């Protein structure tokens, strides 16, 4: 068990073929989960499942530059469930982050922050018990 919020260093930033894997369990009365890939204070890629946004479940993705959020990208496919174990895998490709949950492809997020080598930490937060967070090169 890792304490949330958890910061996972990404030494030398991200690069294509890097695979980040997060294993956890959603708390039974969850409101949100967030993964934040950071370039100093900027958030290159925010991945944010919301369990009760006006009584709908939605995943919101965005980028924060100079303390300002950008244009949201929303996905209504929602593979998380309160109480239940999950696996999130984020594969860095040359033009996007590719996200799979529980082994099924979920979404892609085009790189808006293009200095991939400067995206040097991942913060993991929200209503989860965190079991493991790791990376490897495929």
Ligand X SMILES: COc1cccc(C(=O)N[C@@H]2[C@@H](O)[C@H](O[C@@H]3O[C@H](CO)[C@H](O)[C@H](O)[C@H]3O)[C@@H](CO)O[C@H]2NC(C)=O)c1
- Binding residue positions for a beta-D-galactoside: 69-75
46 near ligand X, rule: CB under 6 A: yes
Residue 35 bridge partners (DSSP): 47, 124
CA-CA distance, 104 to 116, in Å (whole number)?
25
Whole-number Å distance between alpha carbons of 53 and 50: 6
Distance CA 92, CA 24 (A): 21
> Which residues are known binding-site members?
69-75
Name which of 74 and 105 has its Cβ closer to ligand X: 74
Binders of ligand X among residues 69 to 88 (CB under 6 A) are: 69, 72, 74
3-state class (DSSP) for residue 111: coil
Quick one: which segment of 13-21, 66-74, 78-86, 105-113 binds ligand X (CB under 6 A)?
A: 66-74
Query: Which residues form the interface with ligand X (CB under 6 A)?
Result: 46, 48, 60, 62, 69, 72, 74
């Amino acid at each position: 068990p890792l304490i949330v919020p958890y910061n996972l260093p990404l030494p030398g930033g991200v690069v294509p073929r890097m695979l980040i894997t997060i294993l956890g369990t959603v708390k039974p009365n969850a409101n949100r989960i967030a993964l934040d890939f950071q370039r100093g204070n900027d958030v290159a890629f925010h991945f944010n499942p919301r369990f009760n946004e006006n009584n709908r479940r939605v995943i919101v993705c965005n980028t924060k530059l100079d303390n300002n959020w950008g244009r949201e990208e929303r996905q209504s496919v929602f593979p998380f469930e309160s109480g239940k174990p999950f696996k999130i895998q984020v594969l860095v490709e040359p033009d996007h982050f590719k996200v799979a949950v529980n082994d099924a492809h979920l979404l892609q997020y085009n790189h808006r922050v293009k200095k991939l080598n400067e995206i040097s930490k991942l913060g993991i937060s929200g209503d989860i018990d965190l079991t493991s967070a790791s990376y490897t090169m495929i």
